[PDB]
Amino acid sequence: EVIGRIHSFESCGTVDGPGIRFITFFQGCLMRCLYCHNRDTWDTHGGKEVTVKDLMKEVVTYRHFMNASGGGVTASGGEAILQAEFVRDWFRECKKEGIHTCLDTNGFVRHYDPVIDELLEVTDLVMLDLKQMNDEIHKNLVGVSNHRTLRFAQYLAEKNVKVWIRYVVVPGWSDDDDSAHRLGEFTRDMGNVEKIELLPYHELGKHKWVAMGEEYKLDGVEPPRAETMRRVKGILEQYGHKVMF
Ligand SMILES: C[S@@+](CC[C@H](N)C(=O)[O-])C[C@H]1O[C@@H](n2cnc3c(N)ncnc32)[C@H](O)[C@@H]1O
Ligand code: SF4
Ligand SMILES: [Cl-]
Ligand SMILES: [K+]
Ligand SMILES: [K+]
């Protein structure tokens, strides 16, 4: 049995529609986003050990609120794809229960072993972050190059996996016109992308950096103005996808 390492899990209403999402926050991430609102999910050796059986006992207590009309499970974190074998196993069991599955990922896939395709076969929706198309900025914002994530986005397109692209809009970092055009260009031909969703930067989770004795590097940065969200949305819309925030 594969052992999973989790930060926590929670049931919460879906953003829209009926039903609930049971979200497991996986422990461990290898990106370093300056904005991360879950800074305590980074350590790969932390969290709580769980089995798929353990986690399904929690999931099924919400069965009546997860249906085709809305609701399901989400693998988030942290970075769930670092535990691809466990998430594959979990989603396989969710499918046996008829539950919709969603992978919330940074796409930082460094090895293409068989487990990736197996996980995707039992994933109904991938919410992929594309954090910055400009790799010079991406390296300063996230600590790593965007190359692997971009290749994974192309892989998902090749496999026709249903995808929502998520773009966190941070003043001074990801609110500029050029970066928005680059994102529009890159995703234009990906017919598997149902929508691009802009997430406005928020300062929530600062306290988690302070607990760890680490400075929060976006002190003083405010959320983007509505005008900025509308401008980025308009730029992206020129490339043909549905765009929302
Ligand atoms: C905590 S991440 C976990 C999943 C995966 N590691 C990722 O980054 O996509 C879930 C979502 O929250 C976003 N997010 C993280 N910190 C944020 C912040 N300060 N403001 C707005 N969105 C943020 C991420 O970019 C991502 O879309
Ligand atoms: S990739 Fe996701 S969990 Fe990891 S540091 Fe960035 S926002 Fe946080
Ligand atoms: Cl990672
Ligand atoms: K934060
Ligand atoms: K994501």
PDB file of C-alpha atoms and ligand atoms in Angstrom:
ATOM      1  CA  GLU A   1       0.000   0.000   0.000  1.00  0.00           C
ATOM      2  CA  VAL A   2       1.280   3.455  -0.916  1.00  0.00           C
ATOM      3  CA  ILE A   3       1.616   5.869   1.999  1.00  0.00           C
ATOM      4  CA  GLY A   4       0.445   9.408   1.398  1.00  0.00           C
ATOM      5  CA  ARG A   5       1.591  12.462   3.326  1.00  0.00           C
ATOM      6  CA  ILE A   6      -1.114  15.089   3.853  1.00  0.00           C
ATOM      7  CA  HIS A   7      -1.321  18.470   5.488  1.00  0.00           C
ATOM      8  CA  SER A   8      -5.073  18.283   6.025  1.00  0.00           C
ATOM      9  CA  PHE A   9      -8.375  17.621   4.308  1.00  0.00           C
ATOM     10  CA  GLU A  10     -11.682  19.462   4.339  1.00  0.00           C
ATOM     11  CA  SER A  11     -15.167  19.343   2.903  1.00  0.00           C
ATOM     12  CA  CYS A  12     -16.491  22.680   1.628  1.00  0.00           C
ATOM     13  CA  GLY A  13     -19.271  23.735  -0.690  1.00  0.00           C
ATOM     14  CA  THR A  14     -18.378  23.997  -4.331  1.00  0.00           C
ATOM     15  CA  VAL A  15     -17.699  27.490  -5.604  1.00  0.00           C
ATOM     16  CA  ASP A  16     -20.940  27.288  -7.589  1.00  0.00           C
ATOM     17  CA  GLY A  17     -23.626  24.672  -8.074  1.00  0.00           C
ATOM     18  CA  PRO A  18     -24.800  22.118  -5.533  1.00  0.00           C
ATOM     19  CA  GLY A  19     -22.705  19.733  -3.587  1.00  0.00           C
ATOM     20  CA  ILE A  20     -19.375  19.765  -1.895  1.00  0.00           C
ATOM     21  CA  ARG A  21     -15.733  19.385  -2.689  1.00  0.00           C
ATOM     22  CA  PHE A  22     -13.670  17.123  -0.442  1.00  0.00           C
ATOM     23  CA  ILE A  23     -10.203  18.643  -0.785  1.00  0.00           C
ATOM     24  CA  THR A  24      -7.091  16.803   0.393  1.00  0.00           C
ATOM     25  CA  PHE A  25      -4.107  19.136   0.813  1.00  0.00           C
ATOM     26  CA  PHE A  26      -1.028  17.003   0.101  1.00  0.00           C
ATOM     27  CA  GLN A  27       2.130  17.748   2.047  1.00  0.00           C
ATOM     28  CA  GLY A  28       5.215  18.697   0.028  1.00  0.00           C
ATOM     29  CA  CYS A  29       5.941  21.177  -2.772  1.00  0.00           C
ATOM     30  CA  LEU A  30       9.118  21.849  -4.749  1.00  0.00           C
ATOM     31  CA  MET A  31       8.146  25.346  -5.942  1.00  0.00           C
ATOM     32  CA  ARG A  32       8.766  28.478  -3.887  1.00  0.00           C
ATOM     33  CA  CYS A  33       6.111  30.978  -4.958  1.00  0.00           C
ATOM     34  CA  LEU A  34       6.628  34.269  -3.174  1.00  0.00           C
ATOM     35  CA  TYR A  35       2.861  34.508  -2.669  1.00  0.00           C
ATOM     36  CA  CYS A  36       2.145  30.977  -1.479  1.00  0.00           C
ATOM     37  CA  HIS A  37      -0.814  31.098   0.863  1.00  0.00           C
ATOM     38  CA  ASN A  38       0.019  27.575   2.151  1.00  0.00           C
ATOM     39  CA  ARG A  39       3.673  28.009   3.182  1.00  0.00           C
ATOM     40  CA  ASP A  40       3.444  25.183   5.719  1.00  0.00           C
ATOM     41  CA  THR A  41       2.761  22.618   2.955  1.00  0.00           C
ATOM     42  CA  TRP A  42       6.259  22.770   1.448  1.00  0.00           C
ATOM     43  CA  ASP A  43       8.248  20.296   3.539  1.00  0.00           C
ATOM     44  CA  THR A  44       8.079  16.895   1.901  1.00  0.00           C
ATOM     45  CA  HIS A  45       8.811  15.028   5.126  1.00  0.00           C
ATOM     46  CA  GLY A  46       6.098  16.734   7.153  1.00  0.00           C
ATOM     47  CA  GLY A  47       2.392  16.182   7.462  1.00  0.00           C
ATOM     48  CA  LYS A  48       0.413  13.130   8.427  1.00  0.00           C
ATOM     49  CA  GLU A  49       0.693   9.645   6.980  1.00  0.00           C
ATOM     50  CA  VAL A  50      -2.501   8.296   5.457  1.00  0.00           C
ATOM     51  CA  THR A  51      -3.560   5.361   3.307  1.00  0.00           C
ATOM     52  CA  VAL A  52      -6.072   5.496   0.473  1.00  0.00           C
ATOM     53  CA  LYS A  53      -8.354   3.378   2.638  1.00  0.00           C
ATOM     54  CA  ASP A  54      -8.047   5.916   5.473  1.00  0.00           C
ATOM     55  CA  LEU A  55      -8.888   8.780   3.167  1.00  0.00           C
ATOM     56  CA  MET A  56     -11.840   7.050   1.491  1.00  0.00           C
ATOM     57  CA  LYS A  57     -13.458   6.552   4.912  1.00  0.00           C
ATOM     58  CA  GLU A  58     -13.566  10.329   5.208  1.00  0.00           C
ATOM     59  CA  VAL A  59     -14.679  10.858   1.604  1.00  0.00           C
ATOM     60  CA  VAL A  60     -17.685   8.543   1.697  1.00  0.00           C
ATOM     61  CA  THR A  61     -19.220  10.361   4.675  1.00  0.00           C
ATOM     62  CA  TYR A  62     -19.975  13.148   2.139  1.00  0.00           C
ATOM     63  CA  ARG A  63     -21.235  10.824  -0.609  1.00  0.00           C
ATOM     64  CA  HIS A  64     -24.719  12.331  -0.831  1.00  0.00           C
ATOM     65  CA  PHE A  65     -23.295  15.778  -1.612  1.00  0.00           C
ATOM     66  CA  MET A  66     -21.004  14.572  -4.400  1.00  0.00           C
ATOM     67  CA  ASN A  67     -22.941  13.836  -7.595  1.00  0.00           C
ATOM     68  CA  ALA A  68     -22.943  14.462 -11.324  1.00  0.00           C
ATOM     69  CA  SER A  69     -24.758  17.742 -10.659  1.00  0.00           C
ATOM     70  CA  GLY A  70     -21.813  18.987  -8.613  1.00  0.00           C
ATOM     71  CA  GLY A  71     -19.130  18.030  -6.134  1.00  0.00           C
ATOM     72  CA  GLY A  72     -16.375  15.518  -5.921  1.00  0.00           C
ATOM     73  CA  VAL A  73     -12.824  15.256  -4.625  1.00  0.00           C
ATOM     74  CA  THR A  74      -9.813  17.485  -5.220  1.00  0.00           C
ATOM     75  CA  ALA A  75      -6.145  16.708  -4.777  1.00  0.00           C
ATOM     76  CA  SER A  76      -4.479  20.010  -3.843  1.00  0.00           C
ATOM     77  CA  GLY A  77      -1.702  20.987  -1.416  1.00  0.00           C
ATOM     78  CA  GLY A  78       1.186  21.505  -1.533  1.00  0.00           C
ATOM     79  CA  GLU A  79       1.806  19.731  -4.827  1.00  0.00           C
ATOM     80  CA  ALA A  80      -0.236  16.580  -5.256  1.00  0.00           C
ATOM     81  CA  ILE A  81       1.637  15.446  -8.395  1.00  0.00           C
ATOM     82  CA  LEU A  82       4.720  14.811  -6.248  1.00  0.00           C
ATOM     83  CA  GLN A  83       2.676  11.910  -4.832  1.00  0.00           C
ATOM     84  CA  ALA A  84       1.312  10.766  -8.154  1.00  0.00           C
ATOM     85  CA  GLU A  85       1.133   7.066  -7.228  1.00  0.00           C
ATOM     86  CA  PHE A  86      -0.953   7.790  -4.122  1.00  0.00           C
ATOM     87  CA  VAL A  87      -3.228  10.244  -5.966  1.00  0.00           C
ATOM     88  CA  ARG A  88      -3.689   7.713  -8.771  1.00  0.00           C
ATOM     89  CA  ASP A  89      -4.683   5.108  -6.206  1.00  0.00           C
ATOM     90  CA  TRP A  90      -7.040   7.503  -4.461  1.00  0.00           C
ATOM     91  CA  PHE A  91      -8.715   8.621  -7.680  1.00  0.00           C
ATOM     92  CA  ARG A  92      -9.040   4.965  -8.800  1.00  0.00           C
ATOM     93  CA  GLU A  93     -11.047   4.270  -5.639  1.00  0.00           C
ATOM     94  CA  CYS A  94     -13.094   7.442  -6.083  1.00  0.00           C
ATOM     95  CA  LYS A  95     -13.985   6.272  -9.590  1.00  0.00           C
ATOM     96  CA  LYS A  96     -15.190   2.953  -8.186  1.00  0.00           C
ATOM     97  CA  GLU A  97     -17.523   5.062  -6.009  1.00  0.00           C
ATOM     98  CA  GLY A  98     -18.639   7.200  -8.966  1.00  0.00           C
ATOM     99  CA  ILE A  99     -17.003  10.363  -7.631  1.00  0.00           C
ATOM    100  CA  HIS A 100     -15.684  13.196  -9.825  1.00  0.00           C
ATOM    101  CA  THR A 101     -11.960  13.888  -9.442  1.00  0.00           C
ATOM    102  CA  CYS A 102      -9.931  17.085  -9.788  1.00  0.00           C
ATOM    103  CA  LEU A 103      -6.156  17.580  -9.715  1.00  0.00           C
ATOM    104  CA  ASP A 104      -5.035  21.083  -8.571  1.00  0.00           C
ATOM    105  CA  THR A 105      -1.442  21.238  -9.750  1.00  0.00           C
ATOM    106  CA  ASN A 106       1.580  23.351 -10.509  1.00  0.00           C
ATOM    107  CA  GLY A 107       2.438  20.847 -13.287  1.00  0.00           C
ATOM    108  CA  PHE A 108       6.104  20.665 -12.162  1.00  0.00           C
ATOM    109  CA  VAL A 109       6.474  17.185 -13.651  1.00  0.00           C
ATOM    110  CA  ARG A 110      10.158  16.281 -13.867  1.00  0.00           C
ATOM    111  CA  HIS A 111       9.838  12.588 -14.788  1.00  0.00           C
ATOM    112  CA  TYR A 112       7.393  11.032 -17.285  1.00  0.00           C
ATOM    113  CA  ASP A 113       6.944   7.547 -15.911  1.00  0.00           C
ATOM    114  CA  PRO A 114       3.838   5.431 -16.475  1.00  0.00           C
ATOM    115  CA  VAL A 115       2.222   6.682 -13.263  1.00  0.00           C
ATOM    116  CA  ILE A 116       1.436  10.072 -14.831  1.00  0.00           C
ATOM    117  CA  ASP A 117      -0.733   8.606 -17.559  1.00  0.00           C
ATOM    118  CA  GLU A 118      -2.390   6.296 -15.027  1.00  0.00           C
ATOM    119  CA  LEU A 119      -3.238   9.228 -12.811  1.00  0.00           C
ATOM    120  CA  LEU A 120      -4.601  11.242 -15.728  1.00  0.00           C
ATOM    121  CA  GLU A 121      -6.824   8.340 -16.831  1.00  0.00           C
ATOM    122  CA  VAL A 122      -8.746   8.696 -13.529  1.00  0.00           C
ATOM    123  CA  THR A 123      -8.622  12.501 -13.361  1.00  0.00           C
ATOM    124  CA  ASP A 124     -11.715  14.247 -14.656  1.00  0.00           C
ATOM    125  CA  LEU A 125     -10.399  17.838 -14.378  1.00  0.00           C
ATOM    126  CA  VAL A 126      -6.907  19.346 -14.093  1.00  0.00           C
ATOM    127  CA  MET A 127      -6.647  22.884 -12.704  1.00  0.00           C
ATOM    128  CA  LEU A 128      -3.175  23.760 -13.937  1.00  0.00           C
ATOM    129  CA  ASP A 129      -1.366  26.871 -12.719  1.00  0.00           C
ATOM    130  CA  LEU A 130       0.610  28.726 -15.385  1.00  0.00           C
ATOM    131  CA  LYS A 131       2.278  31.176 -12.990  1.00  0.00           C
ATOM    132  CA  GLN A 132       4.299  33.295 -15.438  1.00  0.00           C
ATOM    133  CA  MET A 133       5.094  32.705 -19.120  1.00  0.00           C
ATOM    134  CA  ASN A 134       8.128  34.996 -18.853  1.00  0.00           C
ATOM    135  CA  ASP A 135      10.713  32.633 -17.433  1.00  0.00           C
ATOM    136  CA  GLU A 136      12.977  35.476 -16.298  1.00  0.00           C
ATOM    137  CA  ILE A 137      10.136  36.626 -14.037  1.00  0.00           C
ATOM    138  CA  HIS A 138       9.022  33.054 -13.221  1.00  0.00           C
ATOM    139  CA  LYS A 139      12.428  32.170 -11.784  1.00  0.00           C
ATOM    140  CA  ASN A 140      12.277  35.206  -9.480  1.00  0.00           C
ATOM    141  CA  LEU A 141       8.619  34.644  -8.537  1.00  0.00           C
ATOM    142  CA  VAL A 142       8.663  30.867  -8.046  1.00  0.00           C
ATOM    143  CA  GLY A 143      12.332  29.841  -7.698  1.00  0.00           C
ATOM    144  CA  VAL A 144      12.300  27.421 -10.640  1.00  0.00           C
ATOM    145  CA  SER A 145      11.982  27.595 -14.398  1.00  0.00           C
ATOM    146  CA  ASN A 146       8.566  27.282 -16.006  1.00  0.00           C
ATOM    147  CA  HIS A 147       9.880  24.816 -18.621  1.00  0.00           C
ATOM    148  CA  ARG A 148       8.541  21.640 -17.001  1.00  0.00           C
ATOM    149  CA  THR A 149       5.130  23.168 -16.327  1.00  0.00           C
ATOM    150  CA  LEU A 150       4.833  24.387 -19.929  1.00  0.00           C
ATOM    151  CA  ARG A 151       5.778  20.955 -21.260  1.00  0.00           C
ATOM    152  CA  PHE A 152       3.165  19.399 -19.002  1.00  0.00           C
ATOM    153  CA  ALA A 153       0.526  21.795 -20.266  1.00  0.00           C
ATOM    154  CA  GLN A 154       1.373  20.670 -23.807  1.00  0.00           C
ATOM    155  CA  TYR A 155       1.219  17.039 -22.710  1.00  0.00           C
ATOM    156  CA  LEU A 156      -2.260  17.505 -21.253  1.00  0.00           C
ATOM    157  CA  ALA A 157      -3.341  19.073 -24.528  1.00  0.00           C
ATOM    158  CA  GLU A 158      -1.931  16.155 -26.522  1.00  0.00           C
ATOM    159  CA  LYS A 159      -3.904  13.756 -24.287  1.00  0.00           C
ATOM    160  CA  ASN A 160      -7.089  15.894 -24.504  1.00  0.00           C
ATOM    161  CA  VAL A 161      -7.295  16.123 -20.697  1.00  0.00           C
ATOM    162  CA  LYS A 162      -9.917  18.604 -19.531  1.00  0.00           C
ATOM    163  CA  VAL A 163      -8.048  21.620 -18.134  1.00  0.00           C
ATOM    164  CA  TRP A 164      -8.714  24.921 -16.452  1.00  0.00           C
ATOM    165  CA  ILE A 165      -5.716  27.255 -16.642  1.00  0.00           C
ATOM    166  CA  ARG A 166      -5.227  29.281 -13.465  1.00  0.00           C
ATOM    167  CA  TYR A 167      -3.230  32.512 -13.443  1.00  0.00           C
ATOM    168  CA  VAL A 168      -2.538  34.302 -10.165  1.00  0.00           C
ATOM    169  CA  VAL A 169      -2.405  38.023 -10.944  1.00  0.00           C
ATOM    170  CA  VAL A 170       0.086  39.749  -8.648  1.00  0.00           C
ATOM    171  CA  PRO A 171       0.811  43.503  -9.004  1.00  0.00           C
ATOM    172  CA  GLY A 172       4.385  43.997 -10.082  1.00  0.00           C
ATOM    173  CA  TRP A 173       4.834  40.357 -11.066  1.00  0.00           C
ATOM    174  CA  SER A 174       2.028  38.979 -13.271  1.00  0.00           C
ATOM    175  CA  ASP A 175      -0.229  41.988 -14.039  1.00  0.00           C
ATOM    176  CA  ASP A 176       1.607  43.241 -17.137  1.00  0.00           C
ATOM    177  CA  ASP A 177       0.311  43.202 -20.690  1.00  0.00           C
ATOM    178  CA  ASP A 178       3.232  41.297 -22.215  1.00  0.00           C
ATOM    179  CA  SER A 179       2.956  38.358 -19.819  1.00  0.00           C
ATOM    180  CA  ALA A 180      -0.784  38.206 -20.493  1.00  0.00           C
ATOM    181  CA  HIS A 181      -0.299  38.126 -24.260  1.00  0.00           C
ATOM    182  CA  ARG A 182       2.270  35.372 -23.827  1.00  0.00           C
ATOM    183  CA  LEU A 183      -0.242  33.290 -21.857  1.00  0.00           C
ATOM    184  CA  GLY A 184      -2.883  33.909 -24.499  1.00  0.00           C
ATOM    185  CA  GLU A 185      -0.524  32.833 -27.277  1.00  0.00           C
ATOM    186  CA  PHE A 186       0.637  29.727 -25.436  1.00  0.00           C
ATOM    187  CA  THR A 187      -2.859  28.394 -24.658  1.00  0.00           C
ATOM    188  CA  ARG A 188      -4.594  29.507 -27.865  1.00  0.00           C
ATOM    189  CA  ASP A 189      -4.527  26.142 -29.659  1.00  0.00           C
ATOM    190  CA  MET A 190      -5.288  24.030 -26.548  1.00  0.00           C
ATOM    191  CA  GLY A 191      -8.853  22.970 -27.278  1.00  0.00           C
ATOM    192  CA  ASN A 192      -8.861  20.924 -24.066  1.00  0.00           C
ATOM    193  CA  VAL A 193      -8.675  24.130 -22.011  1.00  0.00           C
ATOM    194  CA  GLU A 194     -12.257  24.877 -21.021  1.00  0.00           C
ATOM    195  CA  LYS A 195     -11.386  28.245 -19.517  1.00  0.00           C
ATOM    196  CA  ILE A 196      -8.661  30.513 -18.156  1.00  0.00           C
ATOM    197  CA  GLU A 197      -9.450  31.625 -14.615  1.00  0.00           C
ATOM    198  CA  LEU A 198      -7.664  34.617 -13.114  1.00  0.00           C
ATOM    199  CA  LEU A 199      -7.036  34.471  -9.379  1.00  0.00           C
ATOM    200  CA  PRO A 200      -6.380  37.866  -7.816  1.00  0.00           C
ATOM    201  CA  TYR A 201      -3.419  37.943  -5.453  1.00  0.00           C
ATOM    202  CA  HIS A 202      -4.419  38.029  -1.779  1.00  0.00           C
ATOM    203  CA  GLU A 203      -2.186  38.457   1.282  1.00  0.00           C
ATOM    204  CA  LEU A 204      -3.853  35.615   3.242  1.00  0.00           C
ATOM    205  CA  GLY A 205      -1.459  33.089   4.684  1.00  0.00           C
ATOM    206  CA  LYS A 206       1.294  35.568   5.530  1.00  0.00           C
ATOM    207  CA  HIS A 207       1.200  34.304   9.119  1.00  0.00           C
ATOM    208  CA  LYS A 208       2.406  30.884   7.933  1.00  0.00           C
ATOM    209  CA  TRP A 209       5.684  32.374   6.694  1.00  0.00           C
ATOM    210  CA  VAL A 210       6.154  34.237   9.964  1.00  0.00           C
ATOM    211  CA  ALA A 211       5.662  31.048  11.972  1.00  0.00           C
ATOM    212  CA  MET A 212       8.562  29.503  10.045  1.00  0.00           C
ATOM    213  CA  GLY A 213      10.761  32.500  10.812  1.00  0.00           C
ATOM    214  CA  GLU A 214      10.909  33.484   7.148  1.00  0.00           C
ATOM    215  CA  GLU A 215      10.271  36.914   5.718  1.00  0.00           C
ATOM    216  CA  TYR A 216       7.274  37.361   3.481  1.00  0.00           C
ATOM    217  CA  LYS A 217       8.750  38.974   0.363  1.00  0.00           C
ATOM    218  CA  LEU A 218       5.513  40.533  -0.943  1.00  0.00           C
ATOM    219  CA  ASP A 219       4.937  42.745   2.098  1.00  0.00           C
ATOM    220  CA  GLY A 220       3.022  45.816   1.028  1.00  0.00           C
ATOM    221  CA  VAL A 221       1.814  44.351  -2.262  1.00  0.00           C
ATOM    222  CA  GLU A 222      -1.920  44.857  -2.527  1.00  0.00           C
ATOM    223  CA  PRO A 223      -4.495  42.872  -4.436  1.00  0.00           C
ATOM    224  CA  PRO A 224      -4.878  43.829  -8.071  1.00  0.00           C
ATOM    225  CA  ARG A 225      -7.458  46.445  -8.893  1.00  0.00           C
ATOM    226  CA  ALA A 226     -10.606  45.408 -10.732  1.00  0.00           C
ATOM    227  CA  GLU A 227      -9.342  47.447 -13.680  1.00  0.00           C
ATOM    228  CA  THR A 228      -6.221  45.309 -13.813  1.00  0.00           C
ATOM    229  CA  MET A 229      -8.248  42.078 -13.703  1.00  0.00           C
ATOM    230  CA  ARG A 230     -10.439  43.400 -16.525  1.00  0.00           C
ATOM    231  CA  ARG A 231      -7.399  44.429 -18.584  1.00  0.00           C
ATOM    232  CA  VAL A 232      -5.686  41.031 -18.251  1.00  0.00           C
ATOM    233  CA  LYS A 233      -8.999  39.286 -18.981  1.00  0.00           C
ATOM    234  CA  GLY A 234      -9.534  41.367 -22.106  1.00  0.00           C
ATOM    235  CA  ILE A 235      -6.050  40.606 -23.403  1.00  0.00           C
ATOM    236  CA  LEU A 236      -6.530  36.883 -22.869  1.00  0.00           C
ATOM    237  CA  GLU A 237      -9.956  36.963 -24.499  1.00  0.00           C
ATOM    238  CA  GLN A 238      -8.360  38.071 -27.766  1.00  0.00           C
ATOM    239  CA  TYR A 239      -6.897  34.546 -28.055  1.00  0.00           C
ATOM    240  CA  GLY A 240     -10.289  32.851 -28.115  1.00  0.00           C
ATOM    241  CA  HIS A 241     -10.803  31.101 -24.780  1.00  0.00           C
ATOM    242  CA  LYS A 242     -13.423  31.744 -22.143  1.00  0.00           C
ATOM    243  CA  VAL A 243     -11.773  33.855 -19.441  1.00  0.00           C
ATOM    244  CA  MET A 244     -13.222  34.634 -16.015  1.00  0.00           C
ATOM    245  CA  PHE A 245     -12.419  35.850 -12.522  1.00  0.00           C
TER     246      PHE A 245
HETATM  247  C1  LIG B   1      -1.978  26.603  -2.684  1.00  0.00           C
HETATM  248  S1  LIG B   1      -2.048  26.136  -4.445  1.00  0.00           S
HETATM  249  C2  LIG B   1      -1.953  24.334  -4.355  1.00  0.00           C
HETATM  250  C3  LIG B   1      -1.920  23.663  -5.726  1.00  0.00           C
HETATM  251  C4  LIG B   1      -0.628  23.831  -6.564  1.00  0.00           C
HETATM  252  N1  LIG B   1       0.539  23.767  -5.686  1.00  0.00           N
HETATM  253  C5  LIG B   1      -0.564  25.122  -7.309  1.00  0.00           C
HETATM  254  O1  LIG B   1       0.159  26.064  -6.948  1.00  0.00           O
HETATM  255  O2  LIG B   1      -1.309  25.231  -8.299  1.00  0.00           O
HETATM  256  C6  LIG B   1      -3.793  26.392  -4.896  1.00  0.00           C
HETATM  257  C7  LIG B   1      -4.002  27.663  -5.698  1.00  0.00           C
HETATM  258  O3  LIG B   1      -3.799  28.833  -4.853  1.00  0.00           O
HETATM  259  C8  LIG B   1      -3.072  29.810  -5.591  1.00  0.00           C
HETATM  260  N2  LIG B   1      -2.488  30.758  -4.664  1.00  0.00           N
HETATM  261  C9  LIG B   1      -1.476  30.478  -3.833  1.00  0.00           C
HETATM  262  N3  LIG B   1      -1.139  31.559  -3.100  1.00  0.00           N
HETATM  263  C10 LIG B   1      -1.998  32.587  -3.507  1.00  0.00           C
HETATM  264  C11 LIG B   1      -2.155  33.925  -3.145  1.00  0.00           C
HETATM  265  N4  LIG B   1      -1.404  34.496  -2.233  1.00  0.00           N
HETATM  266  N5  LIG B   1      -3.127  34.626  -3.799  1.00  0.00           N
HETATM  267  C12 LIG B   1      -3.946  34.079  -4.733  1.00  0.00           C
HETATM  268  N6  LIG B   1      -3.820  32.747  -5.110  1.00  0.00           N
HETATM  269  C13 LIG B   1      -2.829  32.078  -4.492  1.00  0.00           C
HETATM  270  C14 LIG B   1      -2.076  28.948  -6.393  1.00  0.00           C
HETATM  271  O4  LIG B   1      -1.383  29.663  -7.349  1.00  0.00           O
HETATM  272  C15 LIG B   1      -3.047  27.908  -6.883  1.00  0.00           C
HETATM  273  O5  LIG B   1      -3.803  28.335  -8.028  1.00  0.00           O
HETATM  274  S1  SF4 B   2       3.319  25.639  -6.282  1.00  0.00           S
HETATM  275 FE1  SF4 B   2       1.336  25.816  -5.153  1.00  0.00          FE
HETATM  276  S2  SF4 B   2       1.812  25.018  -2.928  1.00  0.00           S
HETATM  277 FE2  SF4 B   2       3.796  25.206  -4.062  1.00  0.00          FE
HETATM  278  S3  SF4 B   2       4.673  27.135  -3.391  1.00  0.00           S
HETATM  279 FE3  SF4 B   2       3.470  27.618  -5.255  1.00  0.00          FE
HETATM  280  S4  SF4 B   2       1.298  28.098  -4.633  1.00  0.00           S
HETATM  281 FE4  SF4 B   2       2.416  27.166  -2.840  1.00  0.00          FE
HETATM  282 CL    CL B   3       6.451  20.370  -6.925  1.00  0.00          CL
HETATM  283  K     K B   4       0.374  34.759   1.021  1.00  0.00           K
HETATM  284  K     K B   5      -3.333  24.792  -9.885  1.00  0.00           K
END
